[PDB]
Design an enzyme around this catalytic site. Structure first.
Site, PDB file in Angstrom:
ATOM      1  CB  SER A  89       2.853  -2.173  -7.920  1.00 28.51           C
ATOM      2  OG  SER A  89       2.571  -3.043  -8.970  1.00 28.51           O
ATOM      3  CE1 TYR A 104       2.418  -6.421  -4.454  1.00 26.64           C
ATOM      4  CE2 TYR A 104       1.429  -6.051  -6.658  1.00 26.64           C
ATOM      5  CZ  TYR A 104       2.442  -5.986  -5.842  1.00 26.64           C
ATOM      6  OH  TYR A 104       3.585  -5.192  -6.059  1.00 26.64           O
TER       7      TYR A 104
HETATM    8  N1  LIG Z   1      10.122  -6.551  -8.772  1.00 27.37           N
HETATM    9  C1  LIG Z   1       8.903  -6.459  -9.359  1.00 27.37           C
HETATM   10  O1  LIG Z   1       8.599  -6.446 -10.429  1.00 27.37           O
HETATM   11  C2  LIG Z   1       7.974  -5.015  -8.579  1.00 27.37           C
HETATM   12  C3  LIG Z   1       7.885  -4.750  -7.297  1.00 27.37           C
HETATM   13  N2  LIG Z   1       7.259  -3.914  -6.830  1.00 27.37           N
HETATM   14  C4  LIG Z   1       7.254  -3.594  -5.388  1.00 27.37           C
HETATM   15  O2  LIG Z   1       8.669  -3.285  -5.093  1.00 27.37           O
HETATM   16  C5  LIG Z   1       8.931  -3.462  -3.852  1.00 27.37           C
HETATM   17  C6  LIG Z   1      10.251  -4.329  -3.735  1.00 27.37           C
HETATM   18  O3  LIG Z   1       9.893  -5.648  -4.632  1.00 27.37           O
HETATM   19  P1  LIG Z   1      11.087  -6.583  -4.831  1.00 27.37           P
HETATM   20  O4  LIG Z   1      12.398  -5.764  -4.673  1.00 27.37           O
HETATM   21  O5  LIG Z   1      10.739  -7.196  -6.235  1.00 27.37           O
HETATM   22  O6  LIG Z   1      10.774  -7.576  -3.576  1.00 27.37           O
HETATM   23  P2  LIG Z   1      11.652  -8.609  -2.889  1.00 27.37           P
HETATM   24  O7  LIG Z   1      10.855  -9.928  -2.563  1.00 27.37           O
HETATM   25  O8  LIG Z   1      13.108  -8.969  -3.896  1.00 27.37           O
HETATM   26  O9  LIG Z   1      12.405  -8.021  -1.614  1.00 27.37           O
HETATM   27  C7  LIG Z   1      11.345  -7.302  -0.578  1.00 27.37           C
HETATM   28  C8  LIG Z   1      12.189  -6.541   0.156  1.00 27.37           C
HETATM   29  O10 LIG Z   1      11.322  -5.847   1.096  1.00 27.37           O
HETATM   30  C9  LIG Z   1      11.949  -6.438   2.500  1.00 27.37           C
HETATM   31  N3  LIG Z   1      10.451  -6.844   3.225  1.00 27.37           N
HETATM   32  C10 LIG Z   1       9.426  -7.530   2.793  1.00 27.37           C
HETATM   33  N4  LIG Z   1       8.646  -7.825   4.019  1.00 27.37           N
HETATM   34  C11 LIG Z   1       9.066  -6.893   5.089  1.00 27.37           C
HETATM   35  C12 LIG Z   1       8.967  -7.042   6.451  1.00 27.37           C
HETATM   36  N5  LIG Z   1       7.643  -7.493   6.765  1.00 27.37           N
HETATM   37  N6  LIG Z   1       9.386  -6.034   7.116  1.00 27.37           N
HETATM   38  C13 LIG Z   1      10.739  -5.485   6.755  1.00 27.37           C
HETATM   39  N7  LIG Z   1      11.156  -5.497   5.457  1.00 27.37           N
HETATM   40  C14 LIG Z   1      10.315  -6.482   4.685  1.00 27.37           C
HETATM   41  C15 LIG Z   1      12.467  -7.567   2.223  1.00 27.37           C
HETATM   42  O11 LIG Z   1      13.412  -7.699   3.387  1.00 27.37           O
HETATM   43  P3  LIG Z   1      13.449  -9.336   4.232  1.00 27.37           P
HETATM   44  O12 LIG Z   1      13.717 -10.337   3.068  1.00 27.37           O
HETATM   45  O13 LIG Z   1      14.929  -8.981   5.147  1.00 27.37           O
HETATM   46  O14 LIG Z   1      12.207  -9.437   4.879  1.00 27.37           O
HETATM   47  C16 LIG Z   1      13.270  -7.181   1.016  1.00 27.37           C
HETATM   48  O15 LIG Z   1      14.305  -6.453   1.404  1.00 27.37           O
HETATM   49  C17 LIG Z   1       7.802  -4.075  -3.240  1.00 27.37           C
HETATM   50  O16 LIG Z   1       7.050  -3.102  -2.314  1.00 27.37           O
HETATM   51  C18 LIG Z   1       6.967  -4.446  -4.513  1.00 27.37           C
HETATM   52  O17 LIG Z   1       5.350  -4.807  -4.096  1.00 27.37           O
HETATM   53  C19 LIG Z   1       6.491  -3.360  -7.677  1.00 27.37           C
HETATM   54  C20 LIG Z   1       5.926  -3.688  -8.812  1.00 27.37           C
HETATM   55  C21 LIG Z   1       6.998  -4.697  -9.573  1.00 27.37           C
END
Ligand SMILES: NC(=O)C1=CN([C@@H]2O[C@H](COP(=O)(O)OP(=O)(O)OC[C@H]3O[C@@H](n4cnc5c(N)ncnc54)[C@H](OP(=O)(O)O)[C@@H]3O)[C@@H](O)[C@H]2O)C=CC1
Ligand SMILES: NC(=O)C1=CN([C@@H]2O[C@H](COP(=O)(O)OP(=O)(O)OC[C@H]3O[C@@H](n4cnc5c(N)ncnc54)[C@H](OP(=O)(O)O)[C@@H]3O)[C@@H](O)[C@H]2O)C=CC1
Lengths: 239, 243
Positions: free
Chosen positions: B131, B145
């Site tokens: 991030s 975070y």
């Molecule tokens: N969107 C943004 O603005 C930003 C996002 N990020 C990073 O990008 C990445 C994706 O974010 P984003 O797409 O917004 O997140 P979302 O909350 O939209 O999606 C999260 C994804 O990660 C998976 N996930 C979460 N926890 C677990 C777990 N314990 N085990 C397995 N899978 C897991 C979820 O699957 P499930 O629901 O099946 O658990 C889902 O597919 C993250 O690391 C986030 O920190 C970084 C900066 C900005």
């Protein structure tokens, strides 16, 4: 006494940098408590030499860290010094050892800092001992350690804003090579480390304690969320 | 197919950025597997639509992460996308929730990356979704975070050197605001976020996937240990004092 009448708690104070910080705050007149885990004799010897109070607490135990901080009452200064190194080829290090490193080096500073902020007054100070390896390109064999020290940067930036309204500053001190049991100035790595430095010596624990003492004092109330490097300009190869 | 004949594992691929990464690698011809935890219906819809393989694995469980990576065999590409946010005043957040954030956001990328390097050939690629909050001054309420995302910087620099002899690169992609379930472009924070940006829009998940795809390809074999920011230049407040 620059810190006469102040309550200081140092996590991991029995040896090395932590012990130098205990000695400095005692010399400056503070009421000092510090924790130890594996070095009971060193802790007792330091308590006898300084008058500081030694307390057992394993920084790998989250609830024990929170309990020792909370049971200290209103702290003026918290210094989180305790940290460990687990070094070697990443594909040959034991996963449980790595996770213990994460617990001590990442989890404990976070939870200790938040807990300390629960009772700390306006003007309070939280200092974490990080590492210049949070910034630099790490040698082979220290990837998890480097990650744990880079974690403190985002941690301190964010907690600085959480704690700002309470009048508390939080800062990370990032040493280069310091002469301790973990990094002896006479050890076999001496010459290589010095070949990478502008000031070709190990730092002394007292020098880290001096930077800590300035940040903990009244001239540093505008200094927060920042990383302060004391490393002899480490990271360039002698040509 | 830029990635025809390549085997890809994406940890956390059921939604958002992760789902876009699955779709991109599938479109580029790879054999794609991805994990999910809480969103089984989303995972099954994505597998049906793309033909990628959905696998349950909770990233908070170290041994399960190690096991899914290990049982993937020789991976060409590992993408660690899974991440969670726990936001609020630090003095009010639950300690177990914070530690779960550390376990998913810090511990899992480390152990997954190390495990993947065991069987990954020369030319392999490891990508972690970090991030921009690993670099920037975090707003109140995301200290843990931000710590977890800065942790990835030292992690990637160090593992790059551990993995160099094996012909594997490791890089961190650092997005700014991306339109996802966790950061909806139409959410109440839209205007504030855009007031902090040079490019006044949320990024699309497909754009993160495009940066991942370049880094995973053959033009990036000299790129390792580095942080790659795709954030619309986030972090400066809109003003007009210079007019
Ligand atoms: N969107 C943004 O603005 C930003 C996002 N990020 C990073 O990008 C990445 C994706 O974010 P984003 O797409 O917004 O997140 P979302 O909350 O939209 O999606 C999260 C994804 O990660 C998976 N996930 C979460 N926890 C677990 C777990 N314990 N085990 C397995 N899978 C897991 C979820 O699957 P499930 O629901 O099946 O658990 C889902 O597919 C993250 O690391 C986030 O920190 C970084 C900066 C900005
Ligand atoms: N020396 C150097 O070159 C550098 C050091 N640092 C950092 O400085 C800090 C101190 O390093 P240094 O003085 O060299 O380390 P030493 O190994 O010499 O001292 C470690 C100190 O931390 C305490 N400690 C370790 N683990 C625990 C635990 N689980 N619970 C409570 N206390 C603990 C030890 O107490 P006990 O023995 O009683 O367990 C001891 O007092 C560390 O955070 C380290 O990462 C950073 C950069 C460079």
């Amino acid at each position: 006494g620059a810190f006469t009448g102040k309550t200081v708690l140092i996590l991991g104070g029995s040896r090395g940098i932590g012990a130098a910080i205990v000695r400095r705050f005692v010399t400056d007149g503070a009421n000092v408590r510090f924790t130890y885990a594996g070095s009971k004799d060193a802790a007792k010897r330091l308590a006898q030499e300084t008058g500081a109070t030694a307390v057992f607490t394993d920084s790998a135990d989250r609830d024990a860290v929170i309990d020792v901080v909370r049971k200290s009452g209103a702290l003026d200064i918290l210094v989180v010094n305790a940290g460990i190194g687990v070094f070697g080829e990443a594909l040959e290090l034991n996963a449980d050892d790595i996770d213990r490193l994460f617990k001590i080096n990442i989890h404990a500073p976070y939870h200790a800092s938040v807990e300390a902020a629960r009772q700390m007054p306006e003007g309070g100070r939280i200092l974490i001992i990080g590492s210049v390896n949070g910034d630099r390109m790490p040698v082979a064999g220290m990837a998890a350690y480097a990650a744990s020290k880079s974690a403190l940067q985002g941690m301190a930036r964010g907690l600085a804003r959480d704690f700002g309204p309470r009048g508390i500053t939080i800062n990370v001190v990032q040493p280069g090579p310091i002469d301790t049991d973990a990094n002896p100035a006479n050890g076999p790595m001496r010459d290589m480390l010095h070949s990478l430095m502008a000031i070709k010596r190990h730092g002394q624990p007292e020098e880290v304690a001096g930077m800590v003492a300035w940040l903990a004092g009244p001239e540093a109330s505008f200094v927060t969320g920042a990383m302060h490097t004391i490393d002899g300009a480490f990271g360039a190869l002698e040509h």
